[PDB]
């Protein structure tokens with residue numbers, strides 16, 4: 001499998017949803033053990049999923065995930081301690097809408113990280129400590145975290161995670177940092193936090209790619225730039241969106257562009273071979289680049305195992321039929337998978 005083909009290069013990972021991590025599906029258990037040597041929880045360790053609005057914890061799924069990784073001796077990545085998404089507004093706000101104090105929020109962060117990173121200390125090899133702190137306008141993201149705490153929200157999260165599990169490989173993770181602009185903004189942020197003494201070991205590039213964009217040359221500049229910070233580079237959430245893109249439509253469509261329309265969902269009956277070919281070539285191009293820079297890269301994780309489970313079926317448009325991953329809806333390897341193997345088989 002892939003994990004073996006790529007053994008001398010980097011870990012090969014997959015995000016697992018709660019149904020898969022339950023271990024009920026023997027077909028998937030077999031596939032995962034063959035193909036992947038790292039796993040990430042797709043949702044179950046996110047603050048708002050693990051805890052309710054009153055802060056109460058329910059460990060069923062997160063424990064199942066860690067049990068699965070332990071059973072199969074898989075490298076496990078915690079995802080994610082501090083993030084602005086999938087987190088209750090109650091963490092940040094009084095019921096009247098007003099923000100709580102920086103001190104009150106610090107206490108919550110302290111409890112959350114001490115509890116969550118503590119429970120799995122030594123079991124999870126790595127943590128996404130902070131996710132998506134740079135906004136797409138290249139300023140710091142204007143989240144409640146940042147508005148209340150300033151950049152201490154980042155500094156404190158890493159410091160805390162490091163005190164709780166000193167052996168964990170701590171990462172900052174983000175999307176679109178493959179691209180000029182956000183790349184350099186991220187470098188500058190991390191640089192200044194590093195000079196402040198923040199513990200950080202790795203840099204996660206999500207790798208939510210389109211079938212065409214961004215180009216290999218852009219991703220290459222990112223691998224190089226982030227490695228220069230003395231950080232290990234991980235590709236954390238790989239997928240390739242093969243469906244009509246609505247990201248850059250004219251202003252008249254700004255609000256309607258996320259609506260379902262049949263023309264935006266052209267492959268409900270299957271992905272035609274010509275698109276399989278393009279998808280395979282795109283993955284081949286990407287993994288050629290990763291191999292080239294294997295000295296800088298610790299891991300390539302896919303954001304799912306097979307196409308049926310991909311979040312891209314419902315994002316950014318609900319109810320589409322996307323084909324972003326290496327295994328199809330019948331758990332069979334797609335052409336892309338064989339191209340990835342051949343890169344290694346043939347030297």
Ligand SMILES: O[C@@H]1[C@@H](O)[C@H](O[C@@H]2CO[C@@H](O[C@@H]3CO[C@@H](O[C@@H]4CO[C@@H](O)[C@H](O)[C@H]4O)[C@H](O)[C@H]3O)[C@H](O)[C@H]2O)OC[C@H]1O
Nearest residue numbers: 085132175176206208209210212213241245246247248249
């Ligand atoms: O919650 C997080 C999500 O918000 C995040 O969504 C990402 C948002 O940005 C997306 O990147 C888009 C990709 O499309 C680009 O424009 C295309 C350029 O090529 C043209 O051929 C095409 O017509 C355009 O539409 C756009 O510049 C770029 O910003 C990214 O894919 C999403 O994943 O994902 C992470 C979540 O946690």
Ligand SMILES: O[C@@H]1[C@@H](O)[C@H](O[C@@H]2CO[C@@H](O[C@@H]3CO[C@H](O)[C@H](O)[C@H]3O)[C@H](O)[C@H]2O)OC[C@H]1O
Nearest residue numbers: 042043079131173175206208236237303310311
């Ligand atoms: O409506 C909710 C869904 O929107 C939710 O979907 C999950 C959203 O998060 C995705 O993972 C992120 C993908 O992008 C980046 O890589 C992030 O780092 C990831 O965390 C999941 O894949 C989706 O399943 O699920 C809950 C539902 O209530």
Ligand SMILES: [Mg+2]
Nearest residue numbers: 070122123124
């Ligand atoms: Mg272990």
